[model samples]
Target chain A: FGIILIKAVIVFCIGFYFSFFLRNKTMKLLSKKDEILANFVAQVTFILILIITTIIALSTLGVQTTSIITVLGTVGIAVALALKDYLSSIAGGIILIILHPFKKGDIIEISGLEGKVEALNFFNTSLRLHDGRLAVLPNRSVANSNIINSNNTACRRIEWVCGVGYGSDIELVHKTIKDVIDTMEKIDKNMPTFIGITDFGSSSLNFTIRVWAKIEDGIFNVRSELIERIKNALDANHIEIPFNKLDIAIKNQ
Target chain B: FGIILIKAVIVFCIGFYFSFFLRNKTMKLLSKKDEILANFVAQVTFILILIITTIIALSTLGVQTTSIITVLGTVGIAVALALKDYLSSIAGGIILIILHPFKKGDIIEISGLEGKVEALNFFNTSLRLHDGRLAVLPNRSVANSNIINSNNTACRRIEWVCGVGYGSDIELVHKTIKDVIDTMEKIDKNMPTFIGITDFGSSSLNFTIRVWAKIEDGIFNVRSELIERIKNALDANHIEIPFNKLDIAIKNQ
Candidate 1:
């Protein structure tokens, strides 16, 4: 009994060491490109570790390897069928982590959820939303959805509509808006501001101002600041921004 | 063989008719109320139709039900273990449908995705974002996440920060903003407009304004319109809305 216990301990320690070594080595290899090779290595390592550990533990109790394998093989098929979706998700998770679809800190929109990816775990992805909420999404669902990674791009476009009185100078308004945007600090020079007559409303002429800014500027903050700045500039220049008014006429029936 | 084939065709037809009947019935029941009981009955009836159809098809093949049940029992345990995650998600999806955490056209934030829900299917929920993007989230993940149904209440608050010259009249600024908001159509009279000194910046005096509006008045649209209105009111009243100005002085030794 003592000898059997000692053998089991040795086997367990060897399996543990081998698993640790394989995991580290695979992680290092996977850190480089070559996703296919890394995945293959990870699968083989996981299977080998499981098999060896199980065999050693069973043998200590005087159980035969062949019988154990036979039973496991039969049970495994049934288990596989029952848990197919979960297993697929696990596989998908591995694929996701290896393929680098999106990285942590990325602002991603998937399956209708948009938030900064805080972490990616084996089963689920964690996101931190703008409203200070935590979102946990299963790996399988994410793999199946249309994922849009906003962080993948270096810049994003911010759009604003400045409405003035119906008869306000269209050409002058356009030039003034463009000039003001150009003068703003931290505005990207490469992406020029676009000023165009977008709409003619009942009481106002709407000029659409579109500008591109670096992602570092933060899309939400930049949009608010730009609109604020435009309003200030328009006010300073004495541009007549209008209000919606109804002209009601009552005729004798 | 001919007799078996004829039986198969009959079974298929019966299953098809039953499925159609159940689907219509379930839909009718669902239309009655947005209650869990309706959703539960619908799901159960739909699933039962499929199960009955499958059993009928199998019976047509002349397979022994007892033997099949015994075999399935033995295999089911293994299968259940393997596919635990998927089965749980399906269960979760059913729960979500029944609970009606959110409904079509409600702006919701779930699993870190924020958008107006477009459709709710058996397995996934579809959302259309403000930025014109489609989001499809698994019902399971949606059920798990912190769900913020923004359109649950008819009224929504719109917030904005208006900055003016450091020396500008604080009381005048507040009065002008309040007056502008009060005059705007669709502004809820029950909810009073809030204007307060939020920040005293190096370049300006920042005042925060929060007003209530109907859910139909989108957050972006309300902010844009309010800013425009505030600017016009300020300009007309001779209030100074200023730009960020930095003064740097250097002394030579």
Candidate 2:
């Protein structure tokens, strides 16, 4: 009986000591990978150790243990079923860490939402939308969905379909567009600029304009700036964009 | 020795039988909640049962088991740490299932992505983007993010910033806009239609036009349709939406 007491005491103390030691070691090792995961693992490990220690010590006191094991396994199965999604998410997160797609602050479009990656958590990825909204997406979804990383490519092609009046000179319109594009500072001169009459609409001739620019300088801004300059230049050169022209006979109303 | 062999065989058979029985029971019970989770738990439970059975039977046949328990505990701790994110994600998923912020087929904006809810799984929510892309979002992120459910509301107010020439009569523009809106089939006449001179710009008077419409009828389509009708009406009544005019002093080039 005294030998049994000694066994219980020794095992309890060692279990407690190892649990503490392993928790710290686990935290230090995992901290380098993910602090959140490390913390969770460390805390849970510590609690589980203490529980196991108690069970082992109690069993040494001439108690049956098979029932305990059965009960534990049963509860574990139920809990595992309940937390199936969380486990998958964690698995997805690990995959994300292993494979670096887009990092923090990268402007990316994933699952059809485009924004700057604000925060990347184990469970979710947060994004700051262009119009200033904080969007949080789960890691599982982020991993599975197709991610469009905007920052991957330095240059982007901007295209515009602009309309000019039907009576406007086609040759002059082409020259005017080329001239406007040449004057713009953001235009990438290395790449070819495209200008062609694409459609003859009801009121105007639709001109398709395409230009390349460095994404860092802003793609949308460059497009808008080009539009303003073109409009101004067209007005200066007596190029009419035209109004909605209709021949209407005014009768006695 | 013979009694020990009998103990091992009897326990092993019973364990194997029960494991199989319990797995099916777990599947049948959890199937109603989530087939995915039920399937996972059932498979895992069956595997764990076999492992546990082997260990118990081996220990009963005069083998040590304390080291096995220690190794198992250590591995469990490590795995738990590694899968912390996944566990959190699962928790988030369970929360989402309990609380129905938005349902399947509902159009919603969550974490900045707006799309139709295509599939809701234990781990992630799938969205079908307007341009036809499937986006999977983890349940964890979905639960935390602010959800803007477009389908919740039946009527949506459509707004437009329309510009007219400064020389045009403001009263005629207002009357014509009102008259044009009245002719549209989709317009919700119950809601007040607003037309006001919002801004006196460099060349044109910026008019703010607002009207309500049933979202199902298509908010964007109605707005575009209204624009076409209004432009035609303005042209018929001789109200010009002036082109960009610049006072250019051209000398001999």
Candidate 3:
């Protein structure tokens, strides 16, 4: 017992000293990169190194490493499944930050939650939903799926499928909406504004209109303001936003 | 060199022989319990065992074990990040299957994908989306978040907040809709129905209603048919389904 205890203490020292190499790597990376990533990646890297080194160190003392890692490792795998979901996210968060998939303020869709990326941390990524709601998505969930970065470029364009009645002129409606958004001071005058026949809907004939907005006035606010203007302009021109058109059968009483 | 080669071959024979014992244990687990998990877990267990034993065997021949494992392990950490994401989902799927958090044919909402549990496999759980689309969600992503198992019970309830005008007869509108859906063959006759004021929207007075549907009739199809009935009932009573009220100001040219 005493001999085994003495060897265990020795094993502890070796692991403790071996940690310096992993810590050194972390320090070097931190000096050159983001602190959040450096801190997280280094932690995972060290733990795996320590596990590998511990098994290696024990073998030197004739500690029968196979049985030890097998027994303890089996115990970990037991807890591993329970913590599988969590450990993955922790690992994934490290990957996301280190690899630089999408950063803060980048609009991303993670696990079907489409929103602007607000913050990235060790566990989860926070986002602002389009409806102005806050959504916290776990890093495990976000890292696995396709992250659609909406604001990939500096400028964003807002799209509207403005529908006028089928009998009404598409050319006239298209021409009218072009000059309407130009009246708004917030819209960028230099960028192109457009309206074209896009789709034939069940209730209305849709004309797709797209207009570029100032980088500062986000797509949300600009779209909201422009929609109001479109409604007002179309109403003044005797155009109609068709209600649900249902052909119903009626019987005379 | 000839003698050492002979010794190495003899050590190899010993390790090769020792592996049988680990395989025996794995086979025993496969016959009695989760065969898929037993198959996966046993492979890992024996691999670690063989590694430790081989290292133990080689050290007698004056070969370095610590340096070898360290080289391989360090190599793994670089490739380790790639496998880590996959490993979690694999592990999580095992956890989910072994424990039965949700069953096949169950309507589940994992993260934001509300769909029927179509299939469960080694890496991902397949779901038929509410919109009749297939969603392949990684098990790690699904297992970590809220698993809302709809239709967990045999009888599932449907909820709707039907709104009418402020001064309209609330009693008459609510009473008429009760008999309207009760007449449908799909609606469960035994379950009680409730209707009361739930919310006060800006344009309408909203009344929340709940109805039970049988397990045979899915919430998807039932909700679809019920919504059509709701529209018909409201339109018949001369009650208006108000559009999103937007205040507008226009320049008088």
User: What docking tier does model 2 reach?
Assistant: incorrect
TM-score of 1: 0.45
Q: iRMS value of model 1?
A: 18.9
Off by over 4 Å in 2: A1-90, A93-253, B1-47, B50-71, B81-98, B167-170, B245-253
Give each model a TM-score: 0.45, 0.47, 0.42
Q: After the best TM-score superposition of candidate 1, give how far the Cα of residue A30 lies from its true spot, in angstroms.
A: 30
lDDT (C-alpha, whole model) for all candidates: 0.67, 0.72, 0.67
Candidate 1: stretches off by over 4 Å: A1-86, A89-253, B1-82
Can you list each candidate's DockQ?
0.03, 0.04, 0.03
Q: Across residues B133-219, which tens digit of lDDT does each residue of candidate 3 receive? A: 355566787778899977687888888776565446767777778868786778877898888777787655777878888877554
Residues forming the 10-long window of minimal summed lDDT in candidate 2 chain A: A244-253
Better of 2 and 3 by DockQ: 2
The candidates, ranked best first by DockQ, are 2, 1, 3
DockQ of 2: 0.04
lDDT of 1 by residue, A1-253 (tens): 3876776776667666777677668766673466676767776666655665666555655666666555655655665576667655664575466545467887887766788988777778889987669888888777656566677657776777778765556556767788778778858888755566554344566677767777886668877877778778888777888776333333332
